[PDB]
Symmetry: C2
Subunit: 80 residues, 2 copies
């Protein structure tokens, strides 16, 4: 089973990505990243137990986010 | 079975090669221990034998290796090719 601290990070991750998407459409982000809307939806909502590195890397690219920044706040929470 | 695409396998292999080069002379056991994974997992990652490497695993290994994930992600393409 996934750990408590693992499902927390999932939620943190999804919230960060959703925020970065802002008003951009889910369809356009998914197309530019090469993933499904379903996957993107699941990630944004924290429903994926272990998201794939290349999935997060692709979304981050499209959304102009640093992966190092992403990693830091999944594992530690956002500020403040 | 869902097969990988040529592009997926190749990205996995590039990622593995980059992590292996970053490890350099450092011990696989030490890397695996500090990242919180098995040597078997690190071996498979380094040699491109994991079908879908997990974000949190790659992040942990990169941190141990003082390697920036942005620098690593830079070697690949995502999306329309064009």
């Amino acid at each position: 089973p996934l750990t408590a601290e693992e499902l927390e990070r999932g939620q943190r991750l999804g919230e960060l990505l959703r925020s970065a998407r802002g008003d951009m459409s889910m369809v356009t982000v998914a197309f530019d990243a090469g993933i499904s809307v379903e996957t993107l939806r699941k990630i944004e909502t924290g429903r994926i137990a272990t998201p794939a590195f290349f999935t997060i890397a692709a979304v981050a690219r499209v959304l102009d986010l640093s992966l190092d920044d992403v990693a830091a706040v999944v594992t530690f929470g956002p500020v403040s």
